[PDB]
Amino acid sequence: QCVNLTTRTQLPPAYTNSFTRGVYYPDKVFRSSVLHSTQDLFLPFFSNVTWFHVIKRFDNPVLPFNDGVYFASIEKSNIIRGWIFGTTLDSKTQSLLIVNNATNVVIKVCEFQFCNDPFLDMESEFRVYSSANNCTFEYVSQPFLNFKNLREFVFKNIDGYFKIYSKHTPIDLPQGFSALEPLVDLPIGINITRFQTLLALHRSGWTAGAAAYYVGYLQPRTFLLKYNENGTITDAVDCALDPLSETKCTLKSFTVEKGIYQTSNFRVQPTESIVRFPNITNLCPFDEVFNATRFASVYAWNRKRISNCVADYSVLYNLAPFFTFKCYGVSPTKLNDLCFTNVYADSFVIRGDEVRQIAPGQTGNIADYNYKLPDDFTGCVIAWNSNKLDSKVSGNYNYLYRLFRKSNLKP
Amino acid sequence: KPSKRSPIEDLLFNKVTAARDLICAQKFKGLTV
Amino acid sequence: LSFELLHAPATVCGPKKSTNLVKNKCVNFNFNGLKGTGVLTESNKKFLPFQQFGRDIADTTDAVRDPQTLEILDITPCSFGGVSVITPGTNTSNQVAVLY
Amino acid sequence: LSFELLHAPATVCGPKKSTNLVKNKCVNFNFNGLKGTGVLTESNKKFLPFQQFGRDIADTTDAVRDPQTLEILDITPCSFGGVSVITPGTNTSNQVAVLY
Amino acid sequence: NTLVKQLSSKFGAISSVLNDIFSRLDPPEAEVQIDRLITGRLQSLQTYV
Amino acid sequence: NTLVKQLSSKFGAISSVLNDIFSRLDPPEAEVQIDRLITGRLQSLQTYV
Ligand SMILES: *[C@@H]1O[C@H](CO)[C@@H](O[C@@H]2O[C@H](CO)[C@@H](O)[C@H](O)[C@H]2NC(C)=O)[C@H](O)[C@H]1NC(C)=O
Ligand SMILES: *[C@@H]1O[C@H](CO)[C@@H](O[C@@H]2O[C@H](CO)[C@@H](O)[C@H](O)[C@H]2NC(C)=O)[C@H](O)[C@H]1NC(C)=O
Ligand SMILES: *[C@@H]1O[C@H](CO)[C@@H](O[C@@H]2O[C@H](CO)[C@@H](O)[C@H](O)[C@H]2NC(C)=O)[C@H](O)[C@H]1NC(C)=O
Ligand SMILES: *[C@@H]1O[C@H](CO)[C@@H](O)[C@H](O)[C@H]1NC(C)=O
Ligand SMILES: *[C@@H]1O[C@H](CO)[C@@H](O)[C@H](O)[C@H]1NC(C)=O
């Protein structure tokens, strides 16, 4: 049970520029006045990320979760309440939920029902879900929470571990540098293809405060980090943007003297490819087996050996309509891309009820005294009607079949 | 001569020495000059 | 129809694939199971009727013949090389020059 | 009580046996599965909370964190060096001198 | 010429060509073959330098 | 500096720390990585010399 507001004024999302923010401590090692090179997941410098603003005006679309999330918010009065990581936004698949209380934070992984517009609403009411489903993992921790609030988080899930790194800055995006420090590691290990967020608004209609946020994605990159006299990362340089940064990485220094320096190589990265092969040329005729002027009886059927042939199995559906066509071992899905040693063709004529008998593991007089098929037989069996050709009003006694025999025949 | 070289220098240069050149073959293997 | 597998070259199979050739462009190619990458050009070399491939003094492929048509194609490795940055002191300015 | 083993982190065993810490002595120690050797001493570094063990320019462990008192201890390899021997000809005299 | 000719040496591997090594079998031995090849090539490069 | 950097290279082994190799691997088949590391370090020392 939720409410839908008709005061929505749709506006296309805006794009802002992340200059130098989005750098975190790679691990738990202390460094002092050492320029260290690292190759890990980071937000590229001068990235073009999304802008979300609500203040009528209200829109919170859902964004993908390709590789990682960098979340930033300039804010006051703690409007934002939490986040949802949901790949489908329903009570069918698993989801994840982070809620920041007034004096607590709760993290959970399970499924809930979300309305057309879930949010939080002094405030003594809270309506973001309409389902009570079981949950597997849950945890409770101490809460994390002019413009004075600037909170930035990063979420990354890899190696079966999900990371929570958070930081706050007291005070578009400001042109500054800050260090993002680790908080929590968790053994969750879930895919997550999309995610949501939370916010709190007070009824007047309704009144919304100054709430805005930015979301960016991480990429694998090489960075150079300069630690100060303490364990604080005071500067970072990304050298996948401009040649000067590449020279800085090559020299492993923040200052470059006058001269010429070799950095990398140059390539072309060709497009598409050529898969040319010679002509088909030699095509031994399959028509002499299928469309022969006459056939042989099942006891003495016709045998043909096929070797060193370019045999196309695609051009076969150009005869009488459709009928038995069953393949064993090799699928009928155009398996011509497999060059075999020899092919044996066994052509005969049998009545309608004996068509099923030509198969491995079948019981019948034809299957024993006339034509025996092994269990490990690989190939295909085709059978088509021939009433208009093999039948005569006076009768066609030419074709025969064996009925009695001392012993069965080998395959 | 446009090269502005003496006959002795020209002779010294001359004495010192379809299908792909060996230099191009070496270039085509990551080896540049 | 039954297929057999014995100790033999096993050369019984239909069409492999076919495609059109594009010249003067860097591209991968696969001729008769021989893989390569480069730019294709019209070749003026006169191969003998039995000869298909071609190697230079460096013992590397530098020519090939179209299996479909008796045309000689010259392969050339695509352009590559190192790059360099020419810059003054960073205390002076930040502009740089790129040399290929 | 039921015991199972699956493709899980399997983080239910509890810490194993622990001993006391000794400083100012070249000893071999184990810290959360990390083997080390040297002398433990008080550390004056400003180890902020999440920093556990530090490293130097040579990329080796310099300080460690005790996961029983949340204290940072500096590690230093104990005294070592080279020995040189000064001696005249053996046919002349047998007296020798050494230099560390 | 030498720095080119060493490119045609197996160096104890199955073949000088490396992509056929990857496509022939699984990594658990192709890795060893590539290790041998790169060690030989690096030794040749160091000698040339 | 180069020599110091040569202490941070696995040369294609599992790790650059001996105790981890000796503890996480069974010693009869863990000798190959140690021998590879020894050979790499000796080669680096010879090049430096
Ligand atoms: C923190 O906020 C959560 C989220 O609303 C509170 O959890 C609710 O608690 C009430 C009463 O205990 C239940 O009726 C709701 O079903 C709970 N909802 C959810 C989503 O858990 C929690 O009580 C708050 N206070 C804490 C954790 O101390
Ligand atoms: C590194 O840490 C030290 C110690 O915490 C900082 O030195 C202190 O800095 C503050 C602020 O400038 C001064 O009020 C103190 O008097 C300093 N302490 C001493 C003993 O001098 C140092 O500033 C830090 N380095 C930074 C932040 O770059
Ligand atoms: C390979 O097959 C192609 C099919 O297009 C042949 O190309 C044409 O073939 C027809 C006869 O099938 C000739 O009349 C044309 O003159 C051919 N044109 C060209 C441009 O070749 C091609 O000749 C075949 N090649 C071989 C060696 O069999
Ligand atoms: C970032 O996206 C906005 C979207 O309008 C665009 O105007 C701007 O040019 C983009 N920035 C860059 C560097 O491409
Ligand atoms: C509000 O939207 C929901 C969709 O989630 C819909 O089921 C409900 O009927 C809407 N409310 C009204 C009053 O129509």
CSV table of C-alpha atoms in Angstrom, one decimal, chain A residues 243-244 247 254-268 270-280 286 290 306-313 330 336-346 377-382, chain C residues 1-22 25-33 37 66-69 78-91 93-96 98-100:
chain,number,residue,atom,x,y,z
A,243,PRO,CA,50.4,11.7,-22.5
A,244,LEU,CA,51.8,13.8,-19.6
A,247,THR,CA,55.2,10.2,-18.7
A,254,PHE,CA,55.1,14.2,-10.1
A,255,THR,CA,57.6,16.5,-11.8
A,256,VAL,CA,58.9,16.0,-15.4
A,257,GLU,CA,62.0,17.8,-16.7
A,258,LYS,CA,62.4,19.2,-20.2
A,259,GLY,CA,63.1,16.5,-22.8
A,260,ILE,CA,61.6,13.7,-24.8
A,261,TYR,CA,60.5,10.4,-23.1
A,262,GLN,CA,59.3,7.1,-24.6
A,263,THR,CA,56.1,6.0,-23.0
A,264,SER,CA,54.3,3.3,-25.0
A,265,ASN,CA,53.7,1.8,-28.5
A,266,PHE,CA,51.2,2.2,-31.3
A,267,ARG,CA,48.9,-0.3,-33.0
A,268,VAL,CA,46.1,-0.4,-35.5
A,270,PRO,CA,42.1,-4.3,-37.3
A,271,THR,CA,38.4,-4.7,-37.9
A,272,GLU,CA,36.6,-8.0,-38.9
A,273,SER,CA,38.4,-11.0,-40.5
A,274,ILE,CA,38.6,-13.1,-43.6
A,275,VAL,CA,37.5,-16.8,-43.3
A,276,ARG,CA,38.0,-17.5,-47.0
A,277,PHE,CA,38.2,-21.2,-48.1
A,278,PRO,CA,38.4,-22.8,-51.5
A,279,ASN,CA,35.5,-24.0,-53.7
A,280,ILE,CA,33.3,-27.0,-52.9
A,286,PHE,CA,23.5,-37.9,-53.2
A,290,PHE,CA,17.8,-40.9,-52.7
A,306,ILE,CA,31.3,-42.1,-49.7
A,307,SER,CA,34.9,-40.9,-49.2
A,308,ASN,CA,36.8,-37.7,-50.1
A,309,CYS,CA,33.5,-35.9,-50.8
A,310,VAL,CA,32.4,-32.3,-50.2
A,311,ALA,CA,28.9,-33.4,-49.1
A,312,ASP,CA,26.4,-30.6,-48.3
A,313,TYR,CA,23.7,-31.8,-45.9
A,330,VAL,CA,25.2,-36.0,-34.4
A,336,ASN,CA,28.8,-30.4,-41.4
A,337,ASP,CA,31.7,-28.7,-39.7
A,338,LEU,CA,33.2,-32.1,-38.8
A,339,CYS,CA,35.3,-34.0,-41.3
A,340,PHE,CA,34.7,-37.7,-40.9
A,341,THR,CA,36.5,-40.8,-42.3
A,342,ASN,CA,33.8,-42.6,-44.4
A,343,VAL,CA,30.1,-42.6,-45.0
A,344,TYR,CA,27.9,-45.6,-45.6
A,345,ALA,CA,24.4,-45.3,-47.2
A,346,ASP,CA,21.9,-48.1,-46.8
A,377,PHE,CA,25.3,-46.1,-34.4
A,378,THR,CA,26.0,-42.5,-35.3
A,379,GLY,CA,24.4,-40.8,-38.2
A,380,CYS,CA,20.8,-40.3,-39.5
A,381,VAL,CA,17.8,-42.2,-40.8
A,382,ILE,CA,15.4,-40.7,-43.4
C,1,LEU,CA,23.5,-42.7,-43.4
C,2,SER,CA,26.3,-43.9,-41.1
C,3,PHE,CA,29.5,-42.1,-40.3
C,4,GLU,CA,32.7,-43.9,-39.4
C,5,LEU,CA,35.9,-42.7,-37.6
C,6,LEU,CA,39.1,-44.6,-38.3
C,7,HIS,CA,42.8,-43.9,-38.3
C,8,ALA,CA,42.7,-41.9,-41.4
C,9,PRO,CA,43.0,-38.2,-42.5
C,10,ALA,CA,39.1,-38.2,-42.5
C,11,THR,CA,38.6,-35.7,-45.4
C,12,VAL,CA,34.8,-36.3,-45.8
C,13,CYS,CA,33.0,-33.1,-45.1
C,14,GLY,CA,31.1,-30.4,-47.0
C,15,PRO,CA,31.6,-26.6,-47.4
C,16,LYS,CA,33.8,-24.9,-44.7
C,17,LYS,CA,33.0,-21.2,-45.3
C,18,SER,CA,33.4,-18.4,-47.8
C,19,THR,CA,33.7,-14.6,-47.8
C,20,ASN,CA,34.7,-11.6,-49.9
C,21,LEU,CA,38.2,-10.1,-49.9
C,22,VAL,CA,38.8,-6.5,-49.1
C,25,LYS,CA,42.9,-2.5,-45.1
C,26,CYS,CA,44.4,-4.0,-41.9
C,27,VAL,CA,42.4,-7.2,-41.1
C,28,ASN,CA,42.8,-10.8,-39.9
C,29,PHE,CA,42.6,-13.6,-42.4
C,30,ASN,CA,42.5,-17.4,-42.5
C,31,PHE,CA,43.5,-19.2,-45.7
C,32,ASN,CA,43.4,-23.0,-45.8
C,33,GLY,CA,43.8,-23.1,-42.0
C,37,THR,CA,46.8,-10.5,-39.7
C,66,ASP,CA,43.6,-17.1,-53.0
C,67,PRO,CA,42.3,-20.7,-52.7
C,68,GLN,CA,39.2,-19.9,-54.7
C,69,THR,CA,40.9,-18.0,-57.6
C,78,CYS,CA,50.1,-3.3,-40.3
C,79,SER,CA,51.8,-0.1,-39.1
C,80,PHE,CA,53.1,0.0,-35.6
C,81,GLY,CA,55.9,1.6,-33.5
C,82,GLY,CA,56.7,3.4,-30.3
C,83,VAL,CA,55.5,6.8,-29.2
C,84,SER,CA,57.3,9.6,-27.5
C,85,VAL,CA,56.3,12.8,-25.5
C,86,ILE,CA,58.3,16.0,-26.0
C,87,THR,CA,57.7,18.4,-23.2
C,88,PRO,CA,59.4,21.3,-21.4
C,89,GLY,CA,59.7,21.5,-17.6
C,90,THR,CA,56.4,21.1,-15.8
C,91,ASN,CA,57.3,24.3,-13.8
C,93,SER,CA,54.0,24.9,-18.7
C,94,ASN,CA,51.9,21.8,-19.3
C,95,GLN,CA,51.6,21.5,-23.1
C,96,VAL,CA,53.1,18.4,-24.6
C,98,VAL,CA,53.4,13.6,-29.3
C,99,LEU,CA,55.8,11.9,-31.8
C,100,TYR,CA,55.0,8.7,-33.6
